[PDB]
Design a protein around this ligand. Structure first.
Ligand code: 75N
Ligand code: 75N
Ligand SMILES: *[C@@H]1O[C@H](CO)[C@@H](O[C@@H]2O[C@H](CO)[C@@H](O)[C@H](O)[C@H]2NC(C)=O)[C@H](O)[C@H]1NC(C)=O
Ligand SMILES: *[C@@H]1O[C@H](CO)[C@@H](O[C@@H]2O[C@H](CO)[C@@H](O)[C@H](O)[C@H]2NC(C)=O)[C@H](O)[C@H]1NC(C)=O
Ligand SMILES: *[C@@H]1O[C@H](CO)[C@@H](O[C@@H]2O[C@H](CO)[C@@H](O)[C@H](O)[C@H]2NC(C)=O)[C@H](O)[C@H]1NC(C)=O
Ligand SMILES: *[C@@H]1O[C@H](CO)[C@@H](O[C@@H]2O[C@H](CO)[C@@H](O)[C@H](O)[C@H]2NC(C)=O)[C@H](O)[C@H]1NC(C)=O
Ligand SMILES: *[C@@H]1O[C@H](CO)[C@@H](O[C@@H]2O[C@H](CO)[C@@H](O)[C@H](O)[C@H]2NC(C)=O)[C@H](O)[C@H]1NC(C)=O
Ligand SMILES: *[C@@H]1O[C@H](CO)[C@@H](O[C@@H]2O[C@H](CO)[C@@H](O)[C@H](O)[C@H]2NC(C)=O)[C@H](O)[C@H]1NC(C)=O
Ligand SMILES: *[C@@H]1O[C@H](CO)[C@@H](O[C@@H]2O[C@H](CO)[C@@H](O)[C@H](O)[C@H]2NC(C)=O)[C@H](O)[C@H]1NC(C)=O
Ligand code: NAG
Ligand code: NAG
Ligand code: NAG
Ligand code: NAG
Ligand code: NAG
Ligand code: NA
Lengths: 728, 728
């Protein structure tokens, strides 16, 4: 009898998915790591050479975390002493290696405790942030030029984001943007002077006698937000003037009237930059298009080139206004925007005309614009077979919009329905990355003729291993509720028999723009639960879910903890109606927003669920950050939406927890969803005399991602689910 | 059939022990609160009068927490707006009511947020501490005289203790000592300038958007300690025009050479004060005897009047050097000290003579000196029947030490083997309080011929209630380890059958000078476990336990987490071999030091225990306070005892928990045993891949004593023990 996919298989990564991570260095070459060696590949022929031997840094004295080759291929930036901070941020030591001289640069070194470093996009200039100030090095062995003198720990951030901008706005620590040829360096400055601090203990190693108090400027819903300014400096002037001026680009008057955010920075040309600003009430955004004025040395943003993007039904963008993709001359751009029917499509703008032209349309959505050439625009969408959980690459002819080719749809339709893509520097080649429903498949293609050059990684080694395992299957389908299709997925036990009643676990995210029903192949906890424990693991995309238009996505506008919660309860009722579910053994679990939804469901008094697990849940919207929370909730004030902020807490439902078995889990060093959120849930349960199970994870953050904690959490949860379902 | 004593009975206090809390006001009368009225009783006859009617403050407008009648009976101090701080500390507002003119005093009121207040021992003067400074009121309606001007929150404490002195030295917030007739006011000043802060989050009500960080000067083992100064002010020479002069009494040279503590303050006469000082290495203490010099207005401590108390086997005193009991003229005193055999007995000292004479001797110990007259000294000891867990009142004739009379031994030997006593002002009367093995019994006695005047409270109502309940029994006995007798107790289920095998729970404290095997009657969680669940609840006093001499008590000197842990394992091993114990179902639990011992036992690899629960455990001695830890452990330095501090952690034993079921519980706002201690245990268990159960209690302190958290913790622990023992 074939073995099943066990918890130890999941925890020890016995069945490993192979990836094919390449780094394009030009229009026809990419770097790839094979046995610690960095190889350089010719995309056209597939032949390779050793770019940098695995022995090169044996006597370096430090474990090299990562590398970055300069665009001109003359130098390599070596990253070591990697100290992780938030989701994207970290600090590190850096050394530069001269590839021609085959020697390490020992003079004018990048200082220790550097926050961020980036090469210019052409050549080998460097911009780095140290002690919250910006520095530029024209040459790697030459002294740096200081750009800002205002940097102040937890107060003034130059060229790096504060906590909330990193997590919720830029999805990056960097707040610097080199112009295309590296002449200009644009950057943002954040001022957190009056932003309140979240404070929590950090225990550290057992040797630390007194716990440390971590203090982070973090605006919770309705609190004082950071303020922002934007500047551009001419880096070519640095060696000629003692102190090059950083020219400020001010936000438009429509933004200056109140609290706002800088939400996008995109260079259009060597002398034209676009900025998108967003009001604190995130249903109004403005794009400014600013030109360098050679005579005054200033940047001017013509009101005739200003573009407004607003929403009457919700917020702007999926998580923020989309980025523009400029034509070469910078006179027009393409941008994903919500059309009249509420579907996200590509609109084509002239920089000085306010009405744009939709180039795509239909009851499906464009996910992202991937590449733009003089002849074609390449994008990913879920158009294929009307499956919102599928992803394919398309090519649209710019001279004729009726000419739209699906590049990936028919390559392997049974195996591959979810693609991402990586184009070479001037889109001469593309790597397709198929991630499901079959095993991931990595392929290389030439853009000149859309022909498949070769298979880079087909996961044949894993396919051979999986043949000896009783793997679960995955069903992706939909149910019709109020004449609307709502998609779901089920991870089904091997030898699934519709005449048997199986215990069911509802795996929840359900946040705005979430998508838990898709065609991706995964080897995860659900794989073990279905394979070894014979539990069906189901997910459902209800109201508030993404990629299906604004009628569905904006259904929870100003009303988090309502329809998306009710729809999970209804999903379990619908799954019961299917006949293969044991109604006495329905559980629910989720992490982060999924933990908030799980807790709201367990506290609903629905009687549908026996038990559930909430990991790092939000419990009260006033505890979560301003940028995310307010996007959907507005402000927690009597004039705005306070009544709903107060009505949508987990704590108010404490009495209903007497009806369920609950396991509450949270990392003590969670900088994102503060441990406070679970500490308030537990106190409310204690106050009404509800027994429940709890687990804190010392010094673990939002991901509970350390090797040991990850294994511990999944082991603890597996015992809990098995006990709930009376499984030995 | 009759009911058992249930978990709800314990949690809802269905069966209440009645008390008889009186307050002696003279040599012949006492105050007693009855039906919210305050009565005054004549001790000779038992007749009473209403002192204060419960209706007097019906229009007060504030809920009165407590009352304090001035020694002359003219005024009543009304305590309200009580806000608890640590174990003894709190702030409150105060009003004074004139009992003669039947009016509240509205002039010169004691301020709000007052930290401590006390009447003089005679008359009606008041001394109070507000904002860390001392104030004196000669008359309740008159303006206060400010005594100190140096008081500073968390830095300078005048007349109040800091965290460590409150918890570990004085067992009180007060650091004020009035002279016998109220002429002088002695006080200590603590300086915490360089003492590190323990910091932890406090979540508060759900309405608090950002958690607060509590910061308390708290010296962990080996850290910088507070410094102390001692002063005496004459309250009879205070001026409205001039600032009060405080006369400092400096510590002897033997103390000033290094870190030290003030550990006792005891007035001998109107003009003589005794002070005891302890070195930071707590095996050397010095008493100074200081006399007021009318001529110079100074306090002089003659070197010929110094008394050294040292220990070669351990620390000095049970938890600190004992208090002296001075004679009427103050020329001699009686003090409990460890004799040459290591047994604590009463020694008689002359103020100017080095050698003291022991007035009691034997293989038993004096617990406390209770009263002293020119003819007799009254004391509590465990002499009777050689039972260290029993307590009786004795008197010793001062003119003939061979004449020792037991005053409580024979009153009711079957019901009463554990007494405490309260004597009237000049020991003319005494109240005996019997607390077991039977129901508590309160009686009143006259000293002249030791007449048993009357029964004050006999708990006959509770006896009637308990007749309809299947109550457990208690067995108190001993086992012999290495020719030494060590006592244990077992709470046995009702209808105990020695032919049946019962699961056993070992209830542990086991700290230095602990005593868990005694004759006290208790209605607690163990009562329910035995009565309803049929579990034997055992406790054992092994090496390090108290009241049995230093050979046993000092066995753990410099070696915490050694013999006291081994001895708990040995006792359970011995109990496991008894025919009435199920060796497959032995559990262990404890709180605080008991949580440390439980965890050390569970991590020992003994294999004796199936499961256990640690509540607020110490996990590493370097995390606990200096005063308690160093008393037993010395300093955590390589030259002193660092190796043993490092070898005695729970964390080092994490791998051994693989074979046990462990439940770890801790309050997040524990200012005493910081949450950090359990946070380090859980991280060590996660690091070795050991599954365990956990529960944090939001905002609960060391006591986890709020009504809802108390019910929740005992509910959660009951489920855990029942699951461990396969009990439905
Ligand atoms: C409170 C909120 C929110 C919402 N959120 C967002 N937002 C946008 C980005 C910035 C973020 N601050 C807010 N991205 C989200 C979510 C969300 O809750 N999940 C669920 C989830 N599930 C699992 C198993 C997780 C496992 C480990 C760590 C996090 C996990 N999180 C999620 N899964 C994939 C993406 N994301
Ligand atoms: C860490 C340490 C120590 C030692 N400690 C001391 N010391 C002397 C006084 C000052 C204190 N800081 C140190 N008195 C102690 C202990 C101790 O651990 N217990 C056990 C225990 N049990 C139960 C059910 C408890 C229930 C709630 C709260 C505390 C509990 N504590 C104990 N019981 C009665 C007295 N005491
Ligand atoms: C991939 O193969 C091609 C063809 O062999 C290499 O192209 C160059 O071809 C010239 C002939 O004019 C040879 O002299 C060289 O060996 C090649 N140039 C360089 C700069 O290496 C090509 O370089 C190969 N690429 C890799 C990454 O190995
Ligand atoms: C960051 O923002 C703070 C205000 O939150 C600015 O601080 C003020 O600076 C002015 C000088 O122009 C002072 O008069 C005020 O006393 C300051 N206010 C506070 C609340 O500190 C600060 O100047 C800004 N810093 C930068 C570099 O923009
Ligand atoms: C470079 O120029 C900047 C911009 O004028 C200087 O920054 C000013 O510095 C002084 C204090 O020394 C203050 O008057 C201003 O508030 C600063 N403005 C900003 C935007 O920082 C900076 O000090 C100059 N550097 C050198 C080396 O002269
Ligand atoms: C990259 O772009 C910048 C901006 O267009 C170029 O700098 C300009 O060069 C032109 C000549 O072609 C002059 O008219 C201007 O004085 C320059 N402007 C500034 C602001 O420096 C720059 O030459 C380009 N760099 C490279 C290496 O091609
Ligand atoms: C104790 O606090 C109370 C309340 O803050 C003070 O009592 C009066 O209280 C009213 C409102 O309850 C206020 O308008 C006044 O400021 C108070 N004044 C007087 C003269 O009573 C009170 O003063 C405080 N007690 C002391 C002794 O300072
Ligand atoms: C309490 O004791 C103090 C100190 O012995 C007494 O004060 C002394 O009283 C006599 C008067 O009979 C004077 O000769 C001394 O000068 C006083 N000494 C000081 C230090 O003030 C006082 O008699 C007693 N007070 C009460 C109220 O009984
Ligand atoms: C008080 O206890 C200390 C620590 O045990 C005793 O210290 C001595 O000094 C160190 C310990 O850190 C060792 O070098 C010696 O072995 C100890 N000296 C001896 C045993 O003579 C100190 O002696 C104790 N004091 C008393 C009065 O017994
Ligand atoms: C980084 O720190 C180390 C040791 O603390 C030092 O030897 C080295 O010079 C530092 N590097 C730079 C670039 O300052
Ligand atoms: C933005 O949202 C607020 C709150 O719903 C609303 O009052 C305002 O009219 C909105 N703007 C648009 C363009 O709908
Ligand atoms: C008790 O009775 C005596 C007389 O027998 C009386 O003088 C005394 O004041 C009474 N005491 C109380 C407290 O009522
Ligand atoms: C408290 O102690 C510090 C040294 O830690 C000293 O500088 C300061 O003067 C002291 N304050 C008082 C009032 O004694
Ligand atoms: C008393 O002492 C304080 C603090 O030193 C001072 O500020 C105040 O003026 C003094 N009062 C008199 C009457 O000397
Ligand atoms: Na009697």
């Amino acid at each position: 009898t074939r073995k099943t996919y066990t918890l130890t298989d999941y925890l020890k990564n016995t069945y490993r998915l192979k990836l094919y991570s390449l780094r394009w260095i030009s229009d026809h070459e990419y770097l790839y790591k094979q046995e610690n060696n960095i190889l350089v590949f010719n995309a056209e022929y597939g032949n390779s050479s050793v770019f940098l031997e695995n022995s090169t840094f044996d006597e370096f004295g430090h474990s090299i975390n990562d590398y970055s080759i300069s665009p001109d291929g003359q130098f390599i930036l070596l990253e070591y002493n990697y100290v992780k901070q938030w989701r994207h941020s970290y600090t590190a030591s850096y050394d530069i290696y001269d590839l021609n001289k085959r020697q390490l640069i020992t003079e004018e070194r990048i200082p220790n405790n550097t926050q961020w470093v980036t090469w210019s996009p052409v050549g080998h200039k460097l911009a780095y942030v140290w002690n919250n100030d910006i520095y530029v090095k024209i040459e790697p062995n030459l002294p740096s030029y200081r750009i800002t003198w205002t940097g102040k720990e937890d107060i003034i951030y130059n060229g790096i984001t504060d906590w909330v901008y990193e997590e919720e706005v830029f999805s990056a620590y960097s707040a610097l943007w080199w112009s295309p040829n590296g002449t200009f360096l644009a950057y943002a400055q954040f001022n957190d002077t009056e932003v309140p601090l979240i404070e929590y203990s950090f225990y550290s190693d057992e040797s630390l006698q007194y716990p440390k108090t971590v203090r982070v400027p973090y605006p919770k819903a309705g609190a004082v937000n950071p303020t922002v300014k934007f500047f551009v400096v001419n880096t070519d002037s640095l060696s000629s003037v003692t102190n090059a001026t950083s020219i400020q680009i001010t936000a438009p008057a429509s933004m200056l009237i109140g609290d706002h955010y800088l939400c996008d920075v995109t260079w259009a040309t060597q002398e034209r930059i676009s900025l998108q600003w967003l009001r604190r009430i995130q249903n109004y955004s403005v794009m400014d298009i600013c030109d360098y004025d050679e005579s005054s040395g200033r940047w001017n943003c013509l009101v005739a080139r200003q573009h407004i993007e607003m929403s009457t039904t919700g917020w702007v963008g999926r998580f923020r206004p989309s980025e523009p993709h400029f034509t070469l001359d910078g006179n027009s751009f393409y941008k994903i925007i919500s059309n009249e029917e509420g579907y996200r499509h590509i609109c084509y703008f002239q920089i000085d005309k306010k009405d744009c032209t939709f180039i795509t349309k239909g009851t499906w959505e464009v996910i992202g614009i991937e590449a733009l050439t003089s002849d074609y625009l390449y994008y990913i969408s879920n158009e294929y077979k009307g499956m919102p959980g599928g992803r394919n690459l398309y090519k649209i002819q710019l001279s004729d919009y009726t000419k739209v080719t699906c590049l990936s749809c028919e390559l392997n339709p049974e195996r591959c329905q979810y693609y991402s893509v990586s184009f070479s520097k001037e889109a001469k080649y593309y790597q397709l990355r198929c991630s499901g429903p079959g095993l991931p498949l990595y392929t290389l293609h030439s853009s000149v003729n859309d022909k498949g050059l070769r298979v880079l990684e087909d996961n044949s080694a894993l396919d051979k291993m999986l043949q000896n395992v009783q793997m679960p299957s995955k069903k992706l389908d939909f149910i019709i509720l109020n004449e609307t299709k709502f998609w779901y997925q089920m991870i089904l036990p091997p030898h699934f028999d519709k005449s048997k009643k199986y215990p069911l676990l509802l795996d929840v995210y359900a946040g705005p723009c979430s998508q838990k029903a898709d065609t991706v192949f995964r080897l995860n906890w659900a794989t073990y639960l279905a394979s070894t424990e014979n539990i069906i693991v189901a997910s459902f995309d209800g109201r508030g879910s993404g990629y299906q238009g604004d009628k569905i996505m904006h259904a929870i506008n100003r009303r988090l903890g309502t329809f998306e919660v009710e729809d999970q309860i209804e999903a379990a009722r619908q799954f019961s109606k299917m006949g293969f579910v044991d109604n006495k053994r329905i559980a629910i679990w989720g992490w982060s927003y999924g933990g908030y939804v799980t807790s709201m469901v367990l506290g609903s008094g629905s009687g549908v669920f026996k038990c559930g697990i909430a990991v790092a849940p939000v419990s009260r919207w006033e505890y979560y950050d301003s940028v995310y929370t307010e996007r959907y909730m507005g402000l927690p004030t009597p004039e705005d939406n306070l009544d709903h902020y107060r009505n949508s807490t987990v704590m108010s439902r404490a009495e209903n927890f007497k009806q369920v078995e609950y396991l509450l889990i949270h990392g003590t060093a969670d900088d994102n969803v503060h441990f406070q959120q679970s500490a308030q849930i537990s106190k409310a349960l204690v106050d009404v005399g509800v027994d429940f199970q709890a687990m804190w994870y010392t010094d673990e953050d939002h991901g509970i991602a350390s090797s040991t904690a990850h294994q511990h959490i999944y082991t603890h949860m597996s015992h809990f689910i098995k006990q709930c379902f009376s499984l030995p």
